[PDB]
Structure formats: C-alpha cells, structure tokens
C-alpha cells in the first residue's frame, strides 16, 4: 500500500528571481530529484525509470521541462494580474501523485499551497479552490481553467500515466522497497534515561522500557528521525528517581530481527 509523491517547491523573491526544485518519494524512499540548476530530472535509484522505455521517459521528461519554464512565467504573470492584491516574496508548493491500492485501484491527487496554505487542487476536469481559500483566487482559477490543453494533459497524467508508471516502479524497485535493516540500540541518561535505536528499515518499530516483564507506561517515544543511508532513528525516554535505574531494560522489536528482540539492561 504505497504512496507516490512528486513534491515541488518554488520561491519567487521578486519579479526577476525565482527557483523551482522537486523531489519524488515512493513511500519513504527517494526516487528522483530535479534541482533548479539541472536541465534534466535525476534518478536517485537504479530502478527510477520503472518499466518505461527510454522513448517514453524522454517524452515525459520533455513535457516536464516545458512545464517548469511555463509554470515559472504563469506565476509571474498571475502576480501581475492580481497586483497589488498579492506581491513578492511568494512560495508555491505542489504535492502530486497517487496512492496504489490492491487489485488495479488507485487515487490520484494534485494539491497546491500558497505561502504554506493548501488553497487549490485539480479535481475531475478542472482546477478548483478548496474550503478556506481567499476569494481572489477565483480569477487565477478562471484563467487556468480556460487552458483546455493543460486540463487534458493533467487529466491524462493523473488518471493514466501516474498509476501506470508507479505500477512499474513497484515491480522494478521491489528488492529496495522490501529491504530489512537491523536496529542497533544503546543507552544513556540526563533523572531521564534514553534508549537510542538506529539503523532500522522499514519504519514500523516497537520500543519500551521494562522492569523484567512489566511494561513501564511512562515510556515516551520521540519522532522518527532519518539517517543519511535511508534507515531510521528513534529514541524512547523514561523519567525516573535517581538510584532506581537498576533492574530497568530497554526492549526493541523489529521485523528485521526475525523474533530475536534486542534487550539492553541498565
């Protein structure tokens, strides 16, 4: 059950300066990047082309090359159209792609944020504002919806190209998507004890302080933090009375261990 996400970030500082950067995620693995500095989209995995032929890929990349330049001028031109209602600096974010379900099913999406707020999506055959959006966006929407060629292209990307492409990626990237990497754990204190757990993939993990078989309900999990090698880091803290540290263990469960839990006693 995997979600494919193309994430675009565009900064427009004044009328003459802008940059657009993209990253692409399949689940929590990066498949592509496209720096503003690069003319071409970069693969960040061997299998990032999926099952697309070289000619299909070139066509798709070319359409995106046209889009990035076209997008950039359209925003600048929309800013002039609303002037002086909105002005620079401006941040635009796109989140687009599809979630793949069992069988042959998928939902595609394309959400647009303006200065950090979700304001616009593509839905059905047209752009629309979402609840909470300012009314001035109705003019940009009117103008964007007049472009039938863009409407038809986006519908084809969302309905057909995206789920087809992603099916191929799932096949081509199976052995990376299904990788198992073992956590390693260690202990420390500041009284607040800390169980550090690092190097595990995939994300699901269970971490608890123990006094033998008694689960300590005071255990607090921090956030999942990334490592540079596409594994995860997590820590579990427990607040205790000084001199009560004897008898406490940290227990870790993860799919990569094949039943053989890590147990570290203080």
């Amino acid at each position, epitope marked *: 059950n995997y979600t494919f996400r193309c994430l675009q970030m565009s900064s427009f500082a004044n009328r003459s300066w802008s940059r657009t950067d993209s990253v692409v995620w399949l689940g929590d693995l990066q498949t592509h990047r496209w720096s503003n500095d690069s003319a071409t989209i970069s693969f960040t995995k061997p299998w990032s082309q999926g099952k697309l032929s070289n000619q299909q890929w070139e066509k798709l990349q070319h359409m995106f090359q046209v889009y990035r330049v076209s997008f950039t001028r359209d925003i600048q031109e929309l800013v002039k159209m609303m002037s002086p209602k909105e002005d620079y600096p401006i941040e635009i974010q796109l989140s687009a792609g599809c979630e793949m379900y069992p069988g042959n099913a998928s939902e595609s999406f394309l959400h647009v944020a303006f200065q950090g707020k979700y304001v616009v999506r593509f839905w059905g055959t047209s752009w629309q504002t979402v609840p909470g959006a300012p009314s001035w966006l109705d003019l940009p929407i009117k*103008v964007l919806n007049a472009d039938q060629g863009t409407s038809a292209t986006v519908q084809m990307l969302l309905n057909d190209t995206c789920p087809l492409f992603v099916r191929g990626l799932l096949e081509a990237g199976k052995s990376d998507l299904e990788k198992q990497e073992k956590p390693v754990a260690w202990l420390s204190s500041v009284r607040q004890l800390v169980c550090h757990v690092s190097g595990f993939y995939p994300k699901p993990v269970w971490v608890m302080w123990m006094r033998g078989d008694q689960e300590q309900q005071g255990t607090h999990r921090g956030d999942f933090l990334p490592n540079a090698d596409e594994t995860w880091y997590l820590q579990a803290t427990l607040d205790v009375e000084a001199g009560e540290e004897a008898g406490l263990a940290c227990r870790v469960k993860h799919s990569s261990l094949g039943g053989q839990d890590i147990i570290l006693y203080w």
Partner: T-cell receptor
Amino acid sequence: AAVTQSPRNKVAVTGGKVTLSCNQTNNHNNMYWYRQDTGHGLRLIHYSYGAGSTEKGDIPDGYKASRPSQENFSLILELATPSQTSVYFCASGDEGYTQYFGPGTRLLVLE
Amino acid sequence: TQVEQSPQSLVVRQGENCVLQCNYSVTPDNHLRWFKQDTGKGLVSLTVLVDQKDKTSNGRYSATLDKDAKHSTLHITATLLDDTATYICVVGDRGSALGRLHFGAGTQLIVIP
C-alpha cells in the same frame, strides 16, 4: 466583440506629446498594444490586466501606458521621435487566448 | 526570430493555386492563426489550428498544422484579385490569456488579373 482606436491617422512633430487611445465595450479585463513595422511581425509594447494595471511588453521604451478604466487603454508618447513612426494595433481579451484586434492607427513623426 | 514565413513574396496569376509556409521554434505551441491583412487595413482571421496534427478549411483557404515539425501551410485555391494582401502567421504559446503571441513578418501575395 469590437475594439476601436483613435485617432486612426496622425502626423506629429519630434518632441511633441502623442496619445493613442483604444476603446473596448466587451467588458474584457485584458488589453494590449502592439506596433507593426515592415520587415517585422507585430511586437508587444505594453499591456494591462485591468483598470490601474499597466505592464511592460517586449519593446516598452519611449512609451508610457495608461489604463484609467476597463473600457480605455492609452499609449502615451511623451517625447515623440521619428523611430516611433509605425502602425499601432490595440487588442482586447478575456481569460481565453483570443485577442480581438482594433483597426490600427498610422503614426508619422516628422522632424 | 521565433516565427519564419516563406516565401517573402510571390506573384501569381488569377485562378492559380498557391501555398504559403510558416516554420517556428516557439515553445510551447498551443495554436497557430493565419491572418489576412489588406494594404493599409486590419487583421482578418482566416483560420486557427489547435491540434498536434490539424487541418482546417474556410472556403478557398485551407491549412495544416504539424506541431512535431513546427510547420504550418496555408493553401489558397483559385486565387482572386482580392487575395492581394499580406498573409501573417501567429503562434500563441498558451491556451489562455497568460499567453504571448509570436508574429511572423508576413508573406506578400500579388494576384495579376
């Protein structure tokens, strides 16, 4: 959808002030000024997305634009010169791609 | 320039057919319009071509568009004296008011009566 220009023809002197006007009763937000010189295609001078908006085109130098209302878009040559001898075309449009052109204005700037 | 027209000019006898070419580098290319401009007059639209491989007609005028080759032709069947005019090719780079128009310099046709 109709567009009119006045004057249709004008002889002017170097250093004079010339104002070319475009009127448009379609309730179009967008208006556009071009000049046509033999050996080139029409080139965009200035344009406007609504009352009070004026934007630089490809060749704006020597011209000032003015959009006082939705109906009228004017092209102002503050200090006219012989190089501004041309045929000027105005156009209007709504959110669609079609620009509806006026009949053109012939300007000759003499020394 | 981004829009090139050929021939620069041509002279044909009344009743003859002729072909006018337009080649462009404009990107992207939403649509291409052919204009007829009589001497000292305005721009009269003859046809607009919008598809990847498109064909249109308007009486004695017919046109093709091939977006892959970035090429259009205007065909005039059985020229009349009133076809004496300049014929102008224009490429719109958007399907909306956000677009810019890219004008060719035109082809001068003279029809001998």
